[PDB]
Amino acid sequence: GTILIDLSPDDKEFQSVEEEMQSTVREHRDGGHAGGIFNRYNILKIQKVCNKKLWERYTHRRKEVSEENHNHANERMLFHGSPFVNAIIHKGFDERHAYIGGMFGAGIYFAENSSKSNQYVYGIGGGTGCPVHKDRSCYICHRQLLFCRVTLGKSFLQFSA
């Protein structure tokens, strides 16, 4: 039920998403080990992901959370990188996409830094890098990230070392 619609680079929506990607790159403490060494991206394509069934699934849950949090969904746009991205856009997020060894428990993780999510495109810790060259810092192979609407509701603040 999923349709992907290309956005034009001349579209304000395209440019807005690109700017959020580019502006939230940062340096990482692993020196680039997991996600590669870079200060910016070459954006090749941005597509809108459309699925009526999955959208209604999301809004149904959002309404539950909003009402439980006294009419506040606390909805954000956040990045997510994953080897399972192709499965996520067709079937939706579920337990198969969670991080059991995550700092904050077995749940599904999202980032404000695009470069943080880039560290997970090829798996936890960058896995073995791109399929073709086995290079976590590959500058040739095309990568994909999701930019997702996320309902936080009442969010527990955990300071992290």
Partner 1 sequence: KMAHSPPGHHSVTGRPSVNGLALAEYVIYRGEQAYPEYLITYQIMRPE
Q: Give the annotated binding-site residues for Zn(2+).
A: 130, 133, 138, 141
Binding mask 51-90 for Zn ion (x = CB under 5 A): ----------------------------------------
Q: According to CB under 8 A, which one of 11, 19, 27, 67 is a site residue for partner 1?
A: 27
Q: Does 146 bind partner 1 (CB under 8 A)?
A: yes
Q: Does 58 bind partner 1 (CB under 8 A)?
A: yes
Nearest approach, Cβ of 32 to partner 1 (angstroms)?
Answer: 9
Contacts with partner 1: how many residues (CB under 8 A)?
85
Per DSSP, the three-state class of 20 is: helix
The identity of residue 143, as a single letter, is R
Q: Does 120 bind partner 1 (CB under 8 A)?
A: no
Supply the DSSP symbol for 98. -
The identity of residue 26, as a single letter, is R
Nearer Cβ to ligand 0E1 (73/121): 121
Give the CA distances from residue 152 to residues 24, 32, 48, in Å, rounded to whole numbers and listed in that order. Answer: 20, 29, 22
Contacts of 18 (CB under 8 A, 6+ apart): 43, 46
- The listed partner (partner 1, Zn ion, ligand 0E1, none) that binds 60, CB under 5 to 8 Å by sort, is partner 1
Contacts of 153 (CB under 8 A, 6+ apart): 65, 66, 68, 69, 72, 73, 74
Q: According to CB under 5 A, which one of 5, 44, 103, 132 is a site residue for Zn ion?
A: 132
Distance CA(118)–CA(150), nearest Å, equals 18
Positions touching Zn ion (CB under 5 A) are: 130, 132-133, 138, 140-141
